[PDB]
Symmetry: D2
């Protein structure tokens, strides 16, 4: 039976401790020897750079001591942690994240079977070399494309652009897809000796949008700003003016979109080369922030950041 | 044949690039007469009159174009059988909900745009405009509130949103679904929005020169409170939170909006999550902080209702009631 | 607290396997009392009374269980405040539309099932049944026709379908969207089906012992006409075509149904395609062949309406009118 | 510039001849030298075994004479032809199928840009070794998972279980996925010397379903029957009884589902081993018929057919 390490971080799936979660699912003994460690116990709405750095280093350090990792986490920023670990984890043994939309005490609580299926996924050797995974609602989702689509639905987690890697049925996964984008040990991002990440903020676009958010970030000397643009990454004129300034003043600017699916493209309405802006592609704002932080540990050059956004 | 007025505001439906193949284009560069003349079959279904209100990308849409549109429809109601509004896709869902809450004309108001420019191969704008006129000319379209017609579908202004950056099929009513489908110039309506719209709302913009100041802040891991603080320091009437999950806030953002709400800033919890209600009775004690829960209203759509709510009241209980009825 | 009757028919909500982990299970093996007793919180929202009508997998649902359900609801209407019907997922969308067209009780009728057996880890059935009772007990649920409540969502019997073989979230109203969403025991209704249902339909099954014979044939490349010929040779009252695309037929299948329609078999074009109307004024001259276009009705749902239509009339024009109103 | 062969078969994208279709899109000269051949001019509702056999042999024979193939086809059975060619084509040069929901003469006709994007896809060398493709609505879809989801929508074609391979924007594709299931030259199906396929029929399940369709197929001595089951591939009792008989009497039986997404699984309500039935997995009825016909050119053994349904 596989040795599987659960790293617990909190979320609705749990204040409840790592060992209690395991004990609630005695069928885990059927498929793995599971050891639990508490990393934090926080709502993922309070997830932060320090936790991300902790997790990346803990998995990188303990890779050779276990066969697989399950990370119990909140739903709210699961998609941000998953893509951060996707880009920084050098362990090519399965790393699976799981949470729950309903608490332990709720009718038809989703947590137990979710944890079960996450351990099935971490225990499957076919799961190796697919990068960091999210397993929710009997589905195996790659850390780059996966996102929460509904505020309360148990089926919230979907890979809305490129689809899932595999479905789980009766403790077995039929894997039919693997992410082409470079992940884990195929990325140059090395966080082993970092204690902080570049400061990257996100501003929202809408009708009559204020430039004051964008100006507060520039005024604070932020390393990068992601735009949650309208439609194909477009910018209200005030926000465009403040970000045009930012980009030629030592702030990297990424155009993403508030629109829940599809790429922010080059060659549409915005001359990215003229402004020194970067097109996020299918990365939504919060994912674009992840990659922009990491790109900025290697470069400040807008053209080299665009190459990163085309590769990872 | 019914009298239909097109009020043009620009958008990619009125855009052009130098190639029919290349994705490059500039917006709001073609007049309404040009859009009308690219749909020769329009004569078969309506007496079309075009007026050019503005010629902008909807990325530059603003309060003043909203007040101008609402006042014009309300003023001209008795002069026409229906309105079509040519507009950009990017903020269509915002304009549509604004007009849905402020127009008192109960004759069909239909918005329409296009994802491909007028210059491109298989341009979507011509059939979209044909289908928007069909809808505007349909007696059954009346008393449904303000509509968006895109990709053979009639959507209500409240739930309608753009779901994809490039796809001609992008416009969907992601929570409650479309009102009807258009085939061969006919509509089978099976739904009407229950939320109050148009002549059933108390919002009157006929005398208004401006709208209350409402901003949107994004939540994410390690979110800066600096955007929230910038809006509070400029004395904003309202802030909408694009929350994570069921409208949750990073602790820094939480503390700044809690403080803001105690000095009388209106604060609405919405969600960055593309579908589902931001509910009461979740992780946030709204009554305790004087916050308002957006329901199915996404952050940009919650702004619209919060701006109009702040023209009646600054009370968080009464703003909650408004978010439960409109 | 309102009086709610559960009429149990079996389904996976009443299923069990020897493992909480393994996918193996057998259906309709648990009584209603057992389902009631696994939802202790039901006492908080209703006075629940269970009656076991049948105990079957919905894969074995049939005309006689449909007549038994409709007659029982109609008979007992005055004895209760609402009905919940525990049923399998597989044919729920068929039963739901049958009852939507035949029940004259305008008190909430709510159907509910589960994708995981009662024995499985994170079983969906207990919260599903809680949420089906909430809906049945909600005064606002009345006059909406027959409902399906699954995964925190209230769906109308006409548009509701199962979209996934295993997913707890499978039930969706794929053309016109849900009626409301349930959070913390409360419902925000924003839609009601416009098609006529319940006390607005002319269909009366109170005296009926049987339903007219209606079969379904599948279209595909190189489709055999043998299924179609088998139904015609047994003198079927109606055939529904699961067409390709916009309800198109392979030429062999076409020729057999054309022939059948000229001897008085009712023939409805539906589509194997999971969303969208099978329209008139496409590739098939329906008036020429005496065919009927199903609209948004999928083949199994078109059967339901064709069976009930054939109890009033065998005329293709009047069956077309029925498919345009119900 | 790539040499690209268009094989025309009909559909709404066209009675209009192969050369007229090309001439309507003069921008094709920008991206390929395109030669057109008329194979048939039929509505794809009348697609048939003979056409499938023609196409497979024509592409296999002409592989070395061109850089890429585009097949113009009706929407209605596009998903059946695509999966047939996916399994029988030995050319690992791009094979792209395209159609249109609207005719040439319609307002905002989709055909022109659809054909353009199909040639972009056939001309891209990154398209090679992904198996037979469908390009519709700016999307590249694998021939196995792709299906029509709406009767009239231009965006009808989707890979509803595993998602698309790539999006097309400005004549370029960002490919992020490839089908894992074995296709083209990785399959043993060889149709080069076949003039007919095994007779496989499809029967529909619903409440009070007649056994008469299933009995007519058995009575005709059909080689196989696919069940479009209810839910997870289940069978109305009458249909189950007639198919239990078929399976032990020289008819292969495949359990598929009328439900538009998800696998028909083993280990649910049906003892497949006891009945000698095969579970289709994510193959819908009409796709299951494709693979069942081809499996039956190699074997009649239910256990060997199940292995085929687990591999292709
Ligand atoms: N269901 C959840 O996990 C929500 C919670 N606020 C979290 O993300 O931690
Ligand atoms: N397709 C479009 O219309 C996009 C454009 N930027 C607009 O919103 O005006
Ligand atoms: N989940 C389910 O209920 C499936 C079952 N075969 C039924 O329809 O009775
Ligand atoms: N749009 C289409 O192609 C439909 C047509 N009946 C076909 O498949 O040939």
């Amino acid at each position: 039976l596989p040795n599987i390490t659960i790293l617990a971080t909190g979320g609705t799936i749990a204040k409840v401790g790592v060992e209690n979660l395991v004990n609630a699912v005695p069928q885990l003994k059927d498929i793995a020897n599971v050891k639990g460690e508490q990393v934090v116990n926080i709502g993922s709405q309070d997830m932060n750079d320090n936790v991300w750095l902790t997790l990346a280093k803990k998995i990188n350090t303990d890779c050779d001591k276990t066969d697989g990792f399950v990370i119990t986490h909140g739903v709210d920023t699961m998609e941000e942690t998953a893509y951060f670990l996707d880009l920084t984890v050098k362990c090519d043994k399965p790393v699976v994240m799981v949470g729950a939309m309903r608490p332990s005490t709720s009718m038809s609580a989703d947590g137990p079977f979710n944890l079960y299926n996450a351990v099935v996924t971490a225990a499957d050797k076919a799961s190796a070399n697919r990068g960091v995974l999210v397993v929710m609602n009997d589905t195996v989702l790659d850390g780059r494309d996966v996102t929460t689509t509904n505020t309360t639905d148990v089926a919230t987690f979907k890979s809305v652009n490129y689809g899932p890697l595999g479905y789980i049925h009766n403790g077995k996964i039929d894997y039919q897809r693997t992410p082409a984008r470079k992940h884990t040990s195929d990325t140059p991002f090395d966080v082993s000796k970092l204690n902080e990440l570049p400061k990257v903020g996100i501003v929202y676009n809408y009708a009559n949008a204020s430039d004051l958010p964008a100006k507060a970030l520039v005024d604070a000397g932020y390393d990068g700003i992601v735009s949650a643009g309208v439609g194909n990454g477009n910018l209200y004129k005030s926000v465009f003016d403040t970000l045009a300034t930012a980009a030629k003043t030592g702030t990297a600017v990424v155009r993403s979109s508030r629109v829940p699916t599809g790429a922010t493209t080059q060659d549409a309405e915005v001359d990215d080369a003229k402004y020194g802006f970067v097109a996020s592609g299918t990365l939504n704002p919060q994912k674009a922030r992840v990659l922009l932080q990491l790109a900025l540990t290697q470069t400040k050059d807008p053209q080299q950041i665009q190459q990163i956004f085309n590769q990872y």
